[PDB]
Amino acid sequence: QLVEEELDRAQERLATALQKLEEAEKAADESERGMKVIESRAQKDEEKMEIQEIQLKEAK
Amino acid sequence: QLVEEELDRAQERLATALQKLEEAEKAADESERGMKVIESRAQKDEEKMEIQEIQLKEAK
């Protein structure tokens, strides 16, 4: 019976493992979404500020 | 017997899942780190952009 209880408890534990893996990878996905949108934001903001400082220096 | 062989199979799947969860945790945390640093960069560059364009206005 020791083998069967190890079996079934490890089965529930691998279920817990798969679900915690799923939530971990979902957190990974949402983090990646935040990352990509802020990469776009940084890109557009930096290009804009570069153009603006160039225009300011040329105006001076 | 064969039951304990099944136990070993279940536990090796468990160990594989543990390695997977460790990788996933590392990935998620480092991803959040990149996210926060890029958000900081975006905010600071936006501030620089706005002050630059206001100064450009005054210069014009």
Side-chain angles (χ1 to χ4, degrees), chain B residues 11-35:
Chain B
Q11 77 88 58
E12 72 90 18
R13 289 138 183 73
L14 207 51
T16 309
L18 315 184
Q19 196 184 78
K20 287 153 173 170
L21 75 87
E22 174 159 2
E23 310 155 53
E25 288 157 344
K26 291 173 160 56
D29 308 329
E30 302 186 37
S31 298
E32 303 281 351
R33 301 178 176 106
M35 223 177 79

mmCIF file of all heavy atoms in Angstrom, chain B residues 11-35:
data_model
loop_
_atom_site.group_PDB
_atom_site.id
_atom_site.type_symbol
_atom_site.label_atom_id
_atom_site.label_comp_id
_atom_site.label_asym_id
_atom_site.label_seq_id
_atom_site.Cartn_x
_atom_site.Cartn_y
_atom_site.Cartn_z
ATOM 1 N N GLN B 11 7.484 9.480 -10.874
ATOM 2 C CA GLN B 11 8.423 10.374 -10.207
ATOM 3 C C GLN B 11 9.415 10.979 -11.192
ATOM 4 O O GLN B 11 9.889 12.101 -10.982
ATOM 5 C CB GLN B 11 9.143 9.637 -9.073
ATOM 6 C CG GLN B 11 10.261 8.698 -9.493
ATOM 7 C CD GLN B 11 11.604 9.391 -9.599
ATOM 8 O OE1 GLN B 11 12.095 9.968 -8.629
ATOM 9 N NE2 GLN B 11 12.205 9.341 -10.780
ATOM 10 N N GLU B 12 9.731 10.274 -12.281
ATOM 11 C CA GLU B 12 10.629 10.859 -13.271
ATOM 12 C C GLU B 12 9.910 11.934 -14.079
ATOM 13 O O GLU B 12 10.498 12.972 -14.413
ATOM 14 C CB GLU B 12 11.222 9.771 -14.173
ATOM 15 C CG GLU B 12 10.280 9.138 -15.175
ATOM 16 C CD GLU B 12 10.268 9.867 -16.503
ATOM 17 O OE1 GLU B 12 11.219 10.632 -16.766
ATOM 18 O OE2 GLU B 12 9.311 9.676 -17.282
ATOM 19 N N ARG B 13 8.624 11.717 -14.377
ATOM 20 C CA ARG B 13 7.826 12.810 -14.922
ATOM 21 C C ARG B 13 7.786 13.987 -13.956
ATOM 22 O O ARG B 13 7.863 15.147 -14.381
ATOM 23 C CB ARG B 13 6.409 12.336 -15.238
ATOM 24 C CG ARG B 13 6.319 11.404 -16.430
ATOM 25 C CD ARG B 13 5.364 10.252 -16.160
ATOM 26 N NE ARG B 13 5.318 9.296 -17.263
ATOM 27 C CZ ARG B 13 6.289 8.435 -17.553
ATOM 28 N NH1 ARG B 13 7.396 8.408 -16.825
ATOM 29 N NH2 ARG B 13 6.156 7.602 -18.577
ATOM 30 N N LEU B 14 7.680 13.703 -12.656
ATOM 31 C CA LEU B 14 7.707 14.759 -11.649
ATOM 32 C C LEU B 14 9.000 15.557 -11.725
ATOM 33 O O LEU B 14 8.978 16.789 -11.733
ATOM 34 C CB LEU B 14 7.524 14.157 -10.254
ATOM 35 C CG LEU B 14 6.907 15.050 -9.174
ATOM 36 C CD1 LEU B 14 5.616 15.678 -9.658
ATOM 37 C CD2 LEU B 14 6.666 14.257 -7.898
ATOM 38 N N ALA B 15 10.141 14.864 -11.770
ATOM 39 C CA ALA B 15 11.432 15.544 -11.821
ATOM 40 C C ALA B 15 11.570 16.383 -13.087
ATOM 41 O O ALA B 15 12.107 17.502 -13.053
ATOM 42 C CB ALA B 15 12.566 14.521 -11.734
ATOM 43 N N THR B 16 11.107 15.848 -14.219
ATOM 44 C CA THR B 16 11.111 16.621 -15.455
ATOM 45 C C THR B 16 10.286 17.892 -15.293
ATOM 46 O O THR B 16 10.706 18.984 -15.705
ATOM 47 C CB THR B 16 10.571 15.763 -16.600
ATOM 48 O OG1 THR B 16 11.265 14.510 -16.621
ATOM 49 C CG2 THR B 16 10.782 16.460 -17.928
ATOM 50 N N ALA B 17 9.113 17.769 -14.669
ATOM 51 C CA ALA B 17 8.280 18.938 -14.417
ATOM 52 C C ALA B 17 8.959 19.923 -13.473
ATOM 53 O O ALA B 17 8.769 21.134 -13.607
ATOM 54 C CB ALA B 17 6.927 18.500 -13.858
ATOM 55 N N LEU B 18 9.748 19.430 -12.514
ATOM 56 C CA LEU B 18 10.461 20.340 -11.617
ATOM 57 C C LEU B 18 11.506 21.148 -12.371
ATOM 58 O O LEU B 18 11.624 22.367 -12.175
ATOM 59 C CB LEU B 18 11.120 19.578 -10.466
ATOM 60 C CG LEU B 18 10.351 18.496 -9.712
ATOM 61 C CD1 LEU B 18 11.183 17.953 -8.563
ATOM 62 C CD2 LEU B 18 9.017 19.030 -9.210
ATOM 63 N N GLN B 19 12.287 20.481 -13.220
ATOM 64 C CA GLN B 19 13.237 21.216 -14.050
ATOM 65 C C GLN B 19 12.514 22.255 -14.901
ATOM 66 O O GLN B 19 12.956 23.412 -15.002
ATOM 67 C CB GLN B 19 14.035 20.251 -14.928
ATOM 68 C CG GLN B 19 15.295 20.867 -15.533
ATOM 69 C CD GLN B 19 16.018 19.923 -16.477
ATOM 70 O OE1 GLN B 19 15.606 19.736 -17.622
ATOM 71 N NE2 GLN B 19 17.105 19.329 -16.001
ATOM 72 N N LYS B 20 11.383 21.862 -15.493
ATOM 73 C CA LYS B 20 10.614 22.791 -16.316
ATOM 74 C C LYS B 20 10.157 24.002 -15.512
ATOM 75 O O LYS B 20 10.252 25.143 -15.980
ATOM 76 C CB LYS B 20 9.415 22.071 -16.932
ATOM 77 C CG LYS B 20 9.778 21.123 -18.057
ATOM 78 C CD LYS B 20 8.756 20.009 -18.187
ATOM 79 C CE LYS B 20 9.031 19.158 -19.416
ATOM 80 N NZ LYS B 20 8.189 17.930 -19.443
ATOM 81 N N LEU B 21 9.641 23.774 -14.302
ATOM 82 C CA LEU B 21 9.132 24.885 -13.505
ATOM 83 C C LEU B 21 10.259 25.822 -13.100
ATOM 84 O O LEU B 21 10.075 27.043 -13.061
ATOM 85 C CB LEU B 21 8.373 24.369 -12.276
ATOM 86 C CG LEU B 21 9.094 23.798 -11.051
ATOM 87 C CD1 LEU B 21 9.482 24.881 -10.054
ATOM 88 C CD2 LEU B 21 8.228 22.753 -10.381
ATOM 89 N N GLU B 22 11.433 25.272 -12.792
ATOM 90 C CA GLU B 22 12.571 26.129 -12.475
ATOM 91 C C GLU B 22 12.920 27.027 -13.659
ATOM 92 O O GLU B 22 13.106 28.246 -13.505
ATOM 93 C CB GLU B 22 13.766 25.273 -12.059
ATOM 94 C CG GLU B 22 15.040 26.049 -11.842
ATOM 95 C CD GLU B 22 16.024 25.296 -10.978
ATOM 96 O OE1 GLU B 22 15.709 24.153 -10.585
ATOM 97 O OE2 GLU B 22 17.107 25.844 -10.688
ATOM 98 N N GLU B 23 12.998 26.438 -14.859
ATOM 99 C CA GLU B 23 13.265 27.243 -16.050
ATOM 100 C C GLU B 23 12.208 28.325 -16.235
ATOM 101 O O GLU B 23 12.531 29.482 -16.542
ATOM 102 C CB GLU B 23 13.333 26.354 -17.290
ATOM 103 C CG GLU B 23 14.229 25.143 -17.158
ATOM 104 C CD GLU B 23 13.831 24.024 -18.100
ATOM 105 O OE1 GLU B 23 13.709 24.282 -19.315
ATOM 106 O OE2 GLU B 23 13.639 22.883 -17.630
ATOM 107 N N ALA B 24 10.935 27.964 -16.048
ATOM 108 C CA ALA B 24 9.851 28.913 -16.276
ATOM 109 C C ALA B 24 9.896 30.060 -15.275
ATOM 110 O O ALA B 24 9.648 31.218 -15.634
ATOM 111 C CB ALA B 24 8.505 28.194 -16.208
ATOM 112 N N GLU B 25 10.209 29.757 -14.015
ATOM 113 C CA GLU B 25 10.316 30.800 -13.002
ATOM 114 C C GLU B 25 11.438 31.768 -13.340
ATOM 115 O O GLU B 25 11.262 32.994 -13.276
ATOM 116 C CB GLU B 25 10.542 30.172 -11.628
ATOM 117 C CG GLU B 25 9.319 29.482 -11.054
ATOM 118 C CD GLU B 25 9.678 28.433 -10.027
ATOM 119 O OE1 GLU B 25 10.856 28.025 -9.984
ATOM 120 O OE2 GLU B 25 8.785 28.019 -9.261
ATOM 121 N N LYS B 26 12.608 31.233 -13.692
ATOM 122 C CA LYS B 26 13.718 32.100 -14.074
ATOM 123 C C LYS B 26 13.328 33.003 -15.239
ATOM 124 O O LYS B 26 13.563 34.222 -15.207
ATOM 125 C CB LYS B 26 14.939 31.252 -14.422
ATOM 126 C CG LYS B 26 15.545 30.565 -13.215
ATOM 127 C CD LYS B 26 16.642 29.600 -13.605
ATOM 128 C CE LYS B 26 17.547 29.317 -12.421
ATOM 129 N NZ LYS B 26 16.786 28.815 -11.246
ATOM 130 N N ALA B 27 12.717 32.418 -16.272
ATOM 131 C CA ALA B 27 12.320 33.195 -17.441
ATOM 132 C C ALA B 27 11.353 34.310 -17.062
ATOM 133 O O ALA B 27 11.541 35.469 -17.452
ATOM 134 C CB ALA B 27 11.696 32.274 -18.492
ATOM 135 N N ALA B 28 10.313 33.975 -16.289
ATOM 136 C CA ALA B 28 9.308 34.967 -15.920
ATOM 137 C C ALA B 28 9.919 36.112 -15.123
ATOM 138 O O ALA B 28 9.626 37.288 -15.386
ATOM 139 C CB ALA B 28 8.186 34.303 -15.123
ATOM 140 N N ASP B 29 10.767 35.794 -14.142
ATOM 141 C CA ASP B 29 11.345 36.849 -13.315
ATOM 142 C C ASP B 29 12.249 37.764 -14.134
ATOM 143 O O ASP B 29 12.140 38.996 -14.048
ATOM 144 C CB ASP B 29 12.103 36.243 -12.134
ATOM 145 C CG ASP B 29 11.267 35.243 -11.359
ATOM 146 O OD1 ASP B 29 10.032 35.417 -11.308
ATOM 147 O OD2 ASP B 29 11.844 34.287 -10.798
ATOM 148 N N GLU B 30 13.146 37.185 -14.941
ATOM 149 C CA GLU B 30 14.015 38.025 -15.760
ATOM 150 C C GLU B 30 13.210 38.851 -16.756
ATOM 151 O O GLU B 30 13.588 39.986 -17.082
ATOM 152 C CB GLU B 30 15.047 37.167 -16.486
ATOM 153 C CG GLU B 30 15.916 36.337 -15.561
ATOM 154 C CD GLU B 30 17.019 35.608 -16.298
ATOM 155 O OE1 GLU B 30 17.571 36.187 -17.257
ATOM 156 O OE2 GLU B 30 17.330 34.457 -15.923
ATOM 157 N N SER B 31 12.084 38.312 -17.226
ATOM 158 C CA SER B 31 11.235 39.060 -18.143
ATOM 159 C C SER B 31 10.611 40.264 -17.450
ATOM 160 O O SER B 31 10.566 41.363 -18.014
ATOM 161 C CB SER B 31 10.159 38.137 -18.706
ATOM 162 O OG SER B 31 10.744 37.075 -19.441
ATOM 163 N N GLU B 32 10.122 40.073 -16.223
ATOM 164 C CA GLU B 32 9.601 41.205 -15.459
ATOM 165 C C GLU B 32 10.685 42.250 -15.217
ATOM 166 O O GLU B 32 10.414 43.460 -15.231
ATOM 167 C CB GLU B 32 9.016 40.723 -14.133
ATOM 168 C CG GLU B 32 7.912 39.689 -14.274
ATOM 169 C CD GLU B 32 6.577 40.303 -14.634
ATOM 170 O OE1 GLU B 32 6.465 41.546 -14.609
ATOM 171 O OE2 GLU B 32 5.636 39.541 -14.944
ATOM 172 N N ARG B 33 11.921 41.800 -14.984
ATOM 173 C CA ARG B 33 13.028 42.734 -14.790
ATOM 174 C C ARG B 33 13.246 43.592 -16.031
ATOM 175 O O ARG B 33 13.344 44.829 -15.949
ATOM 176 C CB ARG B 33 14.300 41.964 -14.438
ATOM 177 C CG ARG B 33 14.180 41.130 -13.179
ATOM 178 C CD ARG B 33 15.454 40.358 -12.897
ATOM 179 N NE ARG B 33 15.373 39.624 -11.638
ATOM 180 C CZ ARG B 33 15.228 38.305 -11.548
ATOM 181 N NH1 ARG B 33 15.153 37.566 -12.645
ATOM 182 N NH2 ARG B 33 15.159 37.724 -10.359
ATOM 183 N N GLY B 34 13.345 42.946 -17.192
ATOM 184 C CA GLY B 34 13.441 43.700 -18.430
ATOM 185 C C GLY B 34 12.279 44.655 -18.611
ATOM 186 O O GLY B 34 12.458 45.798 -19.043
ATOM 187 N N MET B 35 11.073 44.204 -18.264
ATOM 188 C CA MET B 35 9.891 45.050 -18.387
ATOM 189 C C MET B 35 10.046 46.331 -17.577
ATOM 190 O O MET B 35 9.824 47.437 -18.088
ATOM 191 C CB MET B 35 8.652 44.275 -17.933
ATOM 192 C CG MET B 35 7.436 44.449 -18.825
ATOM 193 S SD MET B 35 6.041 43.444 -18.296
ATOM 194 C CE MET B 35 5.416 44.419 -16.930
#
